[PDB]
Design a binder for this molecule. Structure first.
Ligand SMILES: Nc1ncnc2c1ncn2[C@@H]1O[C@H](COP(=O)(O)OP(=O)(O)OP(=O)(O)O)[C@@H](O)[C@H]1O
Lengths: 456, 234, 445
C-alpha cells in the first residue's frame, strides 16, 4: 500500500492544503506551529478504513481514529462577539492498494453530525475483509502477503512499563495489526513476545537434543524460531552496531530475566541501563521488525527486507547526537527497503543526507492557506551550515553582543575603507572580544591583503 | 544590479496587443491571462537580452532548473496602461508555471513586490546608474554603498527589502561565489597566471548570449582588472 | 547552597572521576553513553540528605534516591567471558551550605549491603531540620531564606494556598527531586491565579484585602518578568496574561500585532515557557518576604538533562542566556549535545567527558574557543564531527577534485569518473559544475 497525495480542507490548522509524497522517504519541516503533527494525524486518519476491515476498530474505544468535532476549524474575530466553525472538514487521499490498483478516497465531517465516508472508502474496507478471508483459508497452496501500517508518536517512550505464538494461523497473523495506529508505547508487547520466542527456542532446542527422533517435525519448529530471531537481530544491528558498537539484542535469564545487549569492550549490559538514544532507537526498530515478522511468517529471513507498507515517525532523531543524526535515514532505508517512510525533523544533520525532492517545507498565511514546497537549493551532501541558512533560514553566526560590531566592521572593510583609525580601533576591539582566530576576522584580513595587493 | 540595455522593439503580437491599452486592473488581468499563447517569444527575447541572468538577483535559473517568468517592472495593477509596453517587461527567476512562490520568494515573486511599489524610491535594472547603489560583502549580504547621500541610502535599503534580496538562499549562493573568487585569486597568484585571459571567461559573453552568474560580485572583486577587461572587449 | 567539586568511585560507568563545577552555569558535553546522566544522578544523590530533613520528604522512601546494586561498576573479562562486579560505590561532594559554611560529605554502598552515609552527611540533615524548625516561627522578625533544589530530567513531560505560613512555604519542596513540567498543569494553575486576581481587582472598581491580594500580585509580576527574559528579545512578545474576552485563553502582547494566544505555538516553546514559569513559581512560594524580587534573589541548584529538547535551532541559541538573566543567583548544571547551545558560552563553562580503555574518566575544558563561534566550527572542533556528511560518492568527489587540481583532466580515467559522477549525482551538482569551470579555466592558456 502506498499514498501519493493528500489534500486537507478545514482541518485543524489548515484552511486548505495539498501535499505530495516521495515514494521511499519524505521529510516534513516546519518552523512555526503544529503543521507537521496535523499532517501526520490526517494521514493516520485516512489509513484507518483499511484496518477497520480486520476487526481492528474502536473496540478499545479509540476516539482519536476518526474526525472529531475538536478537529474542525474555529475562527476568532476580535471585532465580533460570535465564533463559528468551518464546515465541512475533509481529508482526501490518492494512492495504490495493490499492484496496478490506483484509488482515491475521501472522509468528511459536517458540524456535529457523525463522520461520513464515500464509496471508495468502503471499498478500502472490503479489500481488508477479503484479505482477511484469504488469510483464514489456510488450506491453500497460494500465499497471500499482508502490508504494514504503523504510527510512532512522541509518546512512544513515556510509560514503557505498563501492560503468545508464531505460526501460519489467522489469529497469529492478524496480531500484527493490534494497536498498530495507537498513540501510546508498545514496548511490553514486544518484550513479552520476544521473551516467549527466546524461551521456546531454547526449550525446543534441548528437547530436540535429548530426543532427535522428531527431526522432521520438531526440527523445523526450531528453525523457524531461529530465523525469526535472526531477522529481528539483523534489523536492529543495521541501526545500532556501526555508530554505537552495541549489537545482538537477546533475552537473558541469568541477568534477572532481562533484555541485554553486547559490546566488544563493555560486555553484556541490560537495555534499561543504556543511554536514552539507544533505548529509543531499539524500540523504534523493534516495533517495525516484529510486526513484519508476525504479519508474514512465510518469509523466514527476509520478512523485514521484503515487506511493504507505510510508517509514520514524529521526531525521528530524538535523543540522537549529530554523528548518529547523519546516518539514521540510510540505516532505516537499509533495514526496511520496501517500506514508505514519512518522518518529521528539525535537524540540519538529517536534512543534509537526503535529496531536495524528499523535503517538504510547510508554511501558512494569515488566512490559513497552507503550502508544502521544496527547497530552492541543493541539500544532498552539503555542509550543515549551508542547509541551516538556505533551508531553515537561520544564520550560523549567533547573536552575541559583538555580532552587530562584526557586521559593521565587515561592511567597512569590504568597501575599501580599512586604513581609517576608526576601522582599526574596531578591528582591535573585536580581536580582543572574539579572538584573532575567528573565521570572519581571518577572511577580513585576507580581504584587506587582497585589496592592498590590487592597488599596484 | 546590472543595467539592461534594450535593443529590440519586440514582437508583432505584443505590438498589436498594445494598440488598445488596458485601463483597469480587471481588463489587464483578463488580457494577460488570454495572452498566454505568445508569451514564449517575448520571454525568449527578454532572456537573450539579459544574457540569461535574473533581472534582480543575477542568477542562472537555467543552470539550476528554476525557470523564468515575465515580470512587470511597474505593477500592472498600479498602472495597467503599460501591461503590453515592452519597455516595462523583464525576466525574473522562479517561473510562474514544489519550490515556488511563498514567504521566502525573491525577485518578482517576493512578498513586498507583490503588494505595492513606490517608484520614487525603487532602484531597478532599467536605471542607467543603478550599479553604484549597491555593494556585495564577504559574508553573502548586499548593502547600500558608502558613497551615497542620506537620501540615496534610504532608496537602496527600501529596494533591498522590497525584493527580499537578503534571503538565506541568496546569501549562501553569494558567499560560495565569494569563496570561489578567493580560490581563483590565490591560484593565479601562485601559478604566475595572467589575470585577463581567465577573466574573459567570466566577463565576456558567448555567441549564445550567456554570462556567468553574479556579474557584479566578480566585477567588484577585481577592482581595476575587471574594468580593463570590460573596456577592452566592450 | 553551592556544590564546587564531585568525586565518583566505581559508579555506573566510571572507575573514577573528579569534576569541578562553575559558579553560575556548567554544561556537560559528550556523545551518547558517555556519562552525563551518571553525573547528574550522582549530584542528585549528594543533595538528598538535605531534602530528607523536611517532612515534605521525610516520608520519601523512593529507591531511586539511594545507591542501588545496579549502580556498581561491571568489568568485562574477555578471557573468562564474564561480568565482574566492583565494590564499593562512593560519592564525595564538596561545597557551601550557608554563607561561610564549607563542608565535604560522602556516601558509599558495599556489595549487596544497604547504603551507608558518613558523619558529615548527617549534619546536612540536621541543618535541614533546623531550617524547618526556624520556618515554624510566629513572632520572629528575622527573615529565613530557603534555597531552591530542583531536578528536571528527560521524563519531565510524561505526566494552591500562596500564604505566608510554614505549610505554604515548605510546599515549594514538593517533588522537587523528581519534578515535572508540562504546559497543561501550568496553564491550569496560572489561570486559577489570574482568576483570583481579577476577582479582587474588580471588587475595587465596584466599591472604591491585604496579604492575600499582594501575594497574588507579586507572584504574577515575578513570573511575567521571568518569561519576559525569555521571549521579549527574539520576538516582541511580553506580559503573558489570562483573558476571558479572548475566549478564556492565555495570551501575549506584541506592540505591532496586538494579542496572540499561547496555544497557537509549537510544543517546544510552550514547554520552555512552562519550565521557566514553574521555576519562578517555586521561587515565589519558597521566599515570600522577597515580594516581586523572589526570582531575582533566590539561591540554589537546578539540574537539567537535555536542556534543548524539542527546540528549534533558533531557540537553542537563546536559552542559556535567558536562564542566566532570569535567575542570576542560581547555579545551573545542564547537559546537551547541540552545537547551537555551545556557540554562545565561554569555554570555562564547558566540560567534555571522556574515558580510557580501563574506565578512568576525565572532564576537561575545551582547548579552543567557542564564544560567538559559527556552529560548523564548534561541530568540527569541540565534537569532532565533520560538518559535511559522508554520502556514498564523497570519496569519488574528493578523488576527482584532487585529480583535476593537479592537472590531469585529459586522461581517460578522469573523464570516465566524471561521466559516472554526472550520471549518479546529476549535471547540476554544484561541485561538478565547479570542476567543469576549473577545467575550462585551465585551457586557453
Ligand atoms: N553498572 C554498570 N557498569 C558498567 N557500565 C554501566 C553500568 N550501568 C550503566 N553502564 C553504562 O553506562 C552508560 C550509560 O551512560 P549515560 O546513560 O549516563 O550516558 P549519556 O548518553 O551521556 O546520557 P543520557 O543519554 O541519559 O543523557 C552506558 O554505556 C551503560 O552501558
Amino acid at each position: 500500500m502506498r499514498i501519493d497525495k493528500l489534500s486537507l480542507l478545514n482541518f485543524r490548522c489548515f484552511k486548505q492544503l495539498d501535499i505530495t509524497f516521495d515514494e521511499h522517504i519524505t521529510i516534513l519541516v516546519a518552523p512555526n506551529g503544529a503543521g507537521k503533527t496535523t499532517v501526520l494525524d490526517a494521514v493516520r486518519l485516512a489509513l484507518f478504513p483499511f484496518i477497520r476491515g480486520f476487526d481492528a476498530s474502536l473496540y478499545v474505544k479509540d476516539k482519536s481514529l476518526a474526525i472529531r468535532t475538536e478537529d474542525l476549524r474555529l475562527i476568532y474575530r476580535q471585532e465580533a462577539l460570535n465564533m463559528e466553525m468551518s464546515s465541512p472538514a475533509k481529508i482526501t487521499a490518492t494512492g495504490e492498494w495493490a499492484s496496478g490498483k490506483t484509488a482515491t478516497w475521501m472522509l468528511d465531517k459536517r458540524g456535529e453530525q457523525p463522520p461520513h465516508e464515500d464509496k471508495m472508502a468502503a471499498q478500502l474496507t472490503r479489500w481488508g475483509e477479503q484479505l482477511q478471508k484469504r488469510v483464514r483459508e489456510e488450506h491453500s497452496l497460494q500465499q497471500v502477503e499482508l502490508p504494514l501500517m504503523l504510527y510512532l508518536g512522541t509518546a512512544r517512550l513515556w510509560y514503557q512499563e505498563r501492560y503468545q505464538r508464531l505460526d501460519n494461523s489467522a489469529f497469529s497473523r492478524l496480531s500484527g495489526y493490534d494497536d498498530c495506529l495507537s498513540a501510546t508505547s508498545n514496548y511490553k508487547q514486544f518484550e513479552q513476545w520476544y521473551s516467549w520466542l527466546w524461551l521456546s527456542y531454547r526449550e525446543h532446542q534441548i528437547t530436540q537434543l535429548e530426543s532427535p527422533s522428531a527431526k522432521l517435525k520438531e526440527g523445523v519448529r526450531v528453525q523457524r524460531m531461529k530465523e525469526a530471531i535472526q531477522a529481528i537481530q539483523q534489523a536492529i544491528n543495521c541501526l545500532t552496531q556501526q555508530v554505537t558498537g552495541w549489537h545482538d539484542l537477546e533475552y537473558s535469564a541469568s541477568h534477572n530475566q532481562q533484555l541485554v545487549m553486547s559490546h566488544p569492550q563493555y560486555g553484556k549490559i541490560p537495555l534499561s541501563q543504556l543511554s536514552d538514544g539507544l533505548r529509543n532507537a531499539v524500540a523504534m526498530v523493534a516495533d517495525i521488525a516484529f510486526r513484519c515478522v508476525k504479519l508474514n511468517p512465510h518469509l523466514q529471513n527476509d520478512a523485514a527486507l521484503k515487506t511493504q507498507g507505510i510508517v509514520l515517525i514524529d521526531e525521528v532523531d530524538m535523543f540522537l547526537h549529530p554523528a548518529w543524526q547523519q546516518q539514521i535515514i540510510q540505516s532505516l532505508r537499509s533495514a526496511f527497503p520496501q517500506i514508505q517512510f514519512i518522518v518529521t525533523t528539525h535537524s540540519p544533520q538529517v536534512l543534509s543526507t537526503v535529496k531536495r525532492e524528499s523535503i517538504r517545507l510547510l508554511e501558512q498565511d494569515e488566512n490559513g492557506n497552507g503550502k508544502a514546497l521544496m527547497p530552492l537549493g541543493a541539500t544532498y551532501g552539503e555542509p550543515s551550515n549551508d542547509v541551516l541558512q538556505s533551508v531553515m533560514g537561520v544564520d550560523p553566526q549567533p547573536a552575541v553582543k559583538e555580532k552587530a560590531d562584526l557586521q559593521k566592521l565587515t561592511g567597512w572593510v569590504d568597501q575599501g575603507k580599512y586604513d581609517e583609525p576608526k576601522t582599526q580601533q574596531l578591528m582591535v576591539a573585536l580581536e580582543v572580544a572574539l579572538g584573532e582566530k575567528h573565521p570572519q576576522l581571518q577572511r577580513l584580513q585576507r580581504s584587506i591583503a587582497r585589496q592592498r595587493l590590487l592597488k599596484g | 544590479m546590472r543595467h539592461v540595455i534594450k535593443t529590440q522593439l519586440g514582437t508583432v503580437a505584443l505590438l498589436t496587443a498594445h494598440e488598445n491599452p488596458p485601463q483597469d486592473a480587471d481588463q489587464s488581468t483578463r488580457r494577460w491571462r488570454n495572452f498566454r499563447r505568445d508569451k514564449a517569444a517575448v520571454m525568449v527575447q527578454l532572456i537573450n537580452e539579459q544574457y540569461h541572468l535574473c533581472c534582480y538577483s543575477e542568477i542562472r535559473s537555467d543552470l539550476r532548473g528554476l525557470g523564468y517568468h515575465i515580470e512587470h517592472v511597474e505593477n500592472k495593477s498600479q498602472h495597467p496602461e503599460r501591461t503590453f509596453d515592452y519597455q516595462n517587461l523583464a525576466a525574473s527567476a522562479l517561473d510562474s508555471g514544489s519550490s515556488l512562490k511563498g514567504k521566502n520568494a525573491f525577485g518578482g515573486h517576493a512578498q513586498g513586490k507583490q503588494d505595492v511599489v513606490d517608484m520614487a524610491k525603487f532602484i531597478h535594472c532599467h536605471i542607467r546608474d543603478c550599479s553604484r547603489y549597491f555593494a556585495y560583502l564577504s559574508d553573502g549580504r548586499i548593502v547600500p554603498a558608502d558613497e551615497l547621500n542620506a537620501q540615496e541610502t534610504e532608496n537602496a535599503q527600501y529596494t533591498i527589502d522590497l525584493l527580499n534580496l537578503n534571503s538565506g538562499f541568496l546569501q549562501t549562493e553569494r558567499r560560495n561565489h565569494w569563496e570561489e573568487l578567493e580560490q581563483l585569486f590565490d591560484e593565479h597568484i601562485e601559478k604566475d597566471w595572467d589575470l585577463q585571459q581567465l577573466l574573459q571567461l567570466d566577463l565576456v559573453s558567448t555567441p549564445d548570449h550567456k554570462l556567468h552568474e553574479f556579474f557584479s560580485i566578480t566585477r567588484q572583486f577585481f577592482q581595476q582588472e575587471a574594468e580593463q577587461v570590460l573596456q577592452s572587449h566592450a
